[PDB]
Design a protein around this ligand. Structure first.
Ligand SMILES: C[C@H](CO)Nc1nc(Nc2ccc(S(N)(=O)=O)cc2)ncc1Br
Length: 275
């Protein structure tokens, strides 16, 4: 890790801090993430997990209590791009491209039993050629993308959690505002309830016996879905509702979502990026 000149800090969670960096000898520009035997073996496995819509993990560096992951560098994240596009909106065909590629990335990881668990716009990275890629997964303060079953204390949650988060991202790209911007776990859960309606045994068998479920939860009626994402067309809306099903078992898989009618006319536009 003397092999790398830090250029700038580009990110941080509590996992670690991410820098754009330059290899002193090869000149390559990379993203360097500065972060237990179990974790070493696990991240070794993730290194083999190559797909066009997953940020490539090039190298793992374990040096004295400290662990660095060396990633390929992409040039902008989706949040910054959504903000830059905020007056105009991202054109539907590019929204659809990005949602489609993200679903290919999920299906691939999911087929390997690898989950993201913490998807958000800052983990979705774009380039000038119209690709979008997922960063930070298998690695497992923003609750906004969190699936209802995590919030209800489920211990053994599934690949469905990433479909939920990706559904909330889709809605946000379309409306140019976050769908569920909670500022606490309960606020997050109650904002979900107030839009989609308070879940019960009819729509989510077993929900009322989940660890943090309370009979005292207010009982809100579900809102009209056309009020949630105007002006998504009805195909996008149907796909969105399948991604935001309460019951993780009813919630559409990445693989099934790829086949949804919404993607019948999918293409790959290039975005206009200001770097
Ligand atoms: C920090 C980000 C998500 O953890 N990780 C990466 N980010 C990038 N690039 C990056 C991230 C953010 C931005 S920003 N915030 O200017 O759009 C620009 C480039 N590249 C590879 C990785 Br891994």
């Amino acid at each position: 890790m003397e092999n790398f000149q830090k250029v700038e800090k580009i990110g941080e969670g509590t996992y670690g801090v991410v820098y754009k960096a330059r290899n002193k000898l090869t000149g390559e520009v990379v993203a360097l993430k500065k972060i237990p035997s179990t974790a070493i073996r696990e991240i070794s496995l993730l290194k083999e997990l190559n797909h066009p819509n997953i940020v490539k993990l090039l190298d793992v560096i374990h040096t004295e209590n400290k662990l660095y992951l060396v990633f390929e560098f992409l040039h902008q994240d989706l949040k910054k791009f959504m903000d830059a596009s905020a007056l105009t909106g991202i054109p539907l065909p590019l929204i659809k491209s990005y949602l489609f590629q993200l679903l290919q990335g999920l299906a691939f990881c999911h087929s390997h039993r690898v989950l993201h668990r913490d998807l958000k716009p800052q983990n979705l990275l774009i380039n000038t050629e119209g690709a979008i890629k997922l960063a930070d997964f298998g690695l497992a303060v923003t609750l906004w993308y969190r699936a209802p079953e995590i919030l209800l204390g489920c211990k053994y949650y599934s690949t469905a959690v990433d479909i939920w988060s990706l559904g909330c991202i889709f809605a946000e790209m379309v409306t140019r505002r976050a769908l569920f911007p909670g500022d606490s776990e309960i606020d997050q859960l109650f904002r979900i309830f107030r839009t989609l309606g308070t879940p019960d045994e009819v729509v989510w068998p077993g929900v009322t016996s989940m660890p943090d479920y309370k009979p005292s939860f207010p009982k809100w009626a579900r809102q009209d879905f056309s009020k949630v994402v105007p002006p998504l067309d009805e195909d996008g809306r149907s796909l969105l509702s399948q991604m935001l099903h309460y019951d993780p078992n009813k919630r559409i898989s990445a693989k099934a979502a790829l086949a949804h009618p919404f993607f019948q006319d999918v293409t790959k536009p290039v975005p206009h990026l200001r770097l």
